[PDB]
Amino acid sequence: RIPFPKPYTSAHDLVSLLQSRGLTIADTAKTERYLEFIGYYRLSAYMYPLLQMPKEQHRYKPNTTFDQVMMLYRFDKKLRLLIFNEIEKIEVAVRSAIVNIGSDMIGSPFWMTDGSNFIDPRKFRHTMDLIDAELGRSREDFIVHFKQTYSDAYPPAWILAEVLPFGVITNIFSNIKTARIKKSIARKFGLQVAPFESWLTIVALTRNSCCHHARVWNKQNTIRPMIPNRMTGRWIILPTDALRIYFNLCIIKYFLDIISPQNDMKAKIDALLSSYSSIDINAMGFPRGWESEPLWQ
Amino acid sequence: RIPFPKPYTSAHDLVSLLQSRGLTIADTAKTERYLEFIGYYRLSAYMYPLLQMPKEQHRYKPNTTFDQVMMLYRFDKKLRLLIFNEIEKIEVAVRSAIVNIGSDMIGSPFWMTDGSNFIDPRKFRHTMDLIDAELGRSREDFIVHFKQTYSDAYPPAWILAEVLPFGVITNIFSNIKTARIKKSIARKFGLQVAPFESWLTIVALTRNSCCHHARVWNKQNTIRPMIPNRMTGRWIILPTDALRIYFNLCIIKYFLDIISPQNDMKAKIDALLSSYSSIDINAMGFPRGWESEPLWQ
RNA sequence: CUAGAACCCGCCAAGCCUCUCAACGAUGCUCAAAUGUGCGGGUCGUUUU
RNA sequence: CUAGAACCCGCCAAGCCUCUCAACGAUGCUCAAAUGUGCGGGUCGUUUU
């Protein structure tokens, strides 16, 4: 394997280099300040759509500006916040629904603590390590007063669901043995069991993309969502590409229409796409005429 | 220790219970739907300010409504998003500043990989476990093409800083041996070294509070920030309580005024506080007349 | 966890009439009700602005 | 990592004139420049709407 031949290039020589590659740059102090504080190689992933089609030569396509790179960066920054604000509601609702339906159909407050209610002890006794690792470090308002006051080993499920991560909760959900309980929890969110599990793991990954500031708008996905056969709500008609960012917005909208019927996620999406209108929608995977579908009315 | 005497109470039954505690409830189907989807014990932390001062009796203070509980919940939900949107800029800028000043003052692209540049190997060889654990699982666009193409063990710092968490980066920063480098990085953000380290750990904790949906607005903090003696910018004059949510906003504003001089964080904060005006500001730790300070002009 | 806790297609052990059938339980269903975390096979290489 | 990678106060090994001093290096500084991840001591119990 080849030794790496490139040195560190200073933020002044980077503007000299970028102007040698054909990128038009104006108000050069601002571009040097962005290259110092945001960085070259972070912005390189947004400069990449403006390279000309033999991209191995690293020359830009003509008539391009650095303000277009700032345009794409600020659009992706606003898009991740728009997705996160609506993920938060589902991330509360699934937790509450699991706790409530488990305590209703089991008849115990403490059902999350017993291995007899879960399918495989090989994952249950693994998850108990994460539960003990969170309760071994938590010092919050209600945890320590509970374990001062009360005898039993772990708090009942409405207490314990506040301090667990969402990737723990959706891993507890898949292990629930009595399938009538899983049917009831999936039936509250208007789906059968297997597409509900698939859309939970899509929601978890879409949250992970928003928390760690990854490139979102023209990113190829790889974990394909499942298509339900039985429905209790509005859905897509026109054929769409599954692995772009559009399908995740459709899944979040489908859960949101059951959680909050009077919601306004569409008007957020229109305000975002109209306000940053210089971006081609076909890279984001919306098919043309997406306003016509029953999910988005 | 006492055995726990409370059963699961059905979401129908809590409305009769809450109405027996004196809380006025109207449009009852909505309140049952919120108790099913958001949950009682999550909302209990926002019902708690409306309990009357002998709170051990669990009776509400008179003239209270459940819409006030929804008011406090929606304010805290909007406040965490307002804090996160401004934390993201600093979370990029500190990474870029560390990579750029290290590559400038060391003269190597690969300075993050060598133990001779860090103080204690007892933390460096610990952090190398996290670096290897991220590169052992990453499959992103640029990582795998680099390790196919090039010989050397880890990518240079502008590549590697994209895939590391912020708690890793601020733990790399404290270990840098040559103190002139630390002075240069702190001097770019207009502070001396020790309050810069203190404000980095306050920024990391304030991000952690926003990502996991914790109660924020009337929460007591415990990790007290440091007060700088040497300054290169505007700061507070009037004496303020350190351990409320106000001081974190002041630190984020101080970094933001150096990153982006034309920023608009006050226009976010005043619109938030005026739009949800039924909430007492003294619980949030703003002293009266906070508009008068040089930091907020 | 965005080559995965991914998607698809057949086969199996049990069971039942929501669908559909000349059959009245299979020519049906397993994403109705119920229920197992059964098995083999196959595609997917991470930015056209 | 919101009883901590927290804050505060003294003491030590080295060093230097940015401050300040009758001293021209201590009556100074260690959050100027430089530099060590040195030491002992002390407070902080996690929602008045």
Side-chain angles (χ1 to χ4, degrees), chain A residues 40-60:
Chain A
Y40 183 88
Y41 184 109
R42 171 161 287 246
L43 291 169
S44 80
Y46 296 88
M47 292 164 179
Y48 180 99
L50 300 176
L51 301 193
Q52 166 179 240
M53 201 75 238
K55 287 191 175 72
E56 311 95 320
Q57 293 323 319
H58 304 261
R59 294 211 71 191
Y60 286 95

Side-chain angles (χ1 to χ4, degrees), chain A residues 214-235:
Chain A
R215 176 180 58 97
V216 152
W217 79 286
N218 71 351
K219 176 60 164 54
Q220 282 279 115
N221 300 322
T222 56
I223 296 174
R224 190 180 293 257
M226 192 145 178
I227 301 297
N229 294 339
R230 299 290 89 89
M231 288 288 206
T232 320
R234 323 320 291 141
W235 191 238

Side-chain angles (χ1 to χ4, degrees), chain B residues 206-272:
Chain B
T206 294
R207 201 186 94 107
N208 284 5
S209 293
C210 297
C211 276
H212 299 294
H213 315 303
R215 176 180 58 97
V216 152
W217 79 286
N218 71 351
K219 176 60 164 54
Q220 282 279 115
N221 300 322
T222 56
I223 296 174
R224 190 181 293 257
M226 192 145 178
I227 301 297
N229 294 338
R230 299 291 88 88
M231 288 288 206
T232 320
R234 323 320 291 141
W235 191 238
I236 297 171
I237 299 176
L238 188 56
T240 183
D241 190 346
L243 295 185
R244 309 302 284 218
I245 189 59
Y246 174 70
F247 211 105
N248 295 355
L249 296 167
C250 296
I251 297 170
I252 294 162
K253 184 57 161 62
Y254 188 86
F255 290 141
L256 182 44
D257 279 6
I258 302 177
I259 292 159
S260 292
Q262 273 94 330
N263 70 107
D264 64 358
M265 201 205 197
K266 189 178 181 293
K268 305 289 152 59
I269 294 166
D270 53 38
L272 174 62

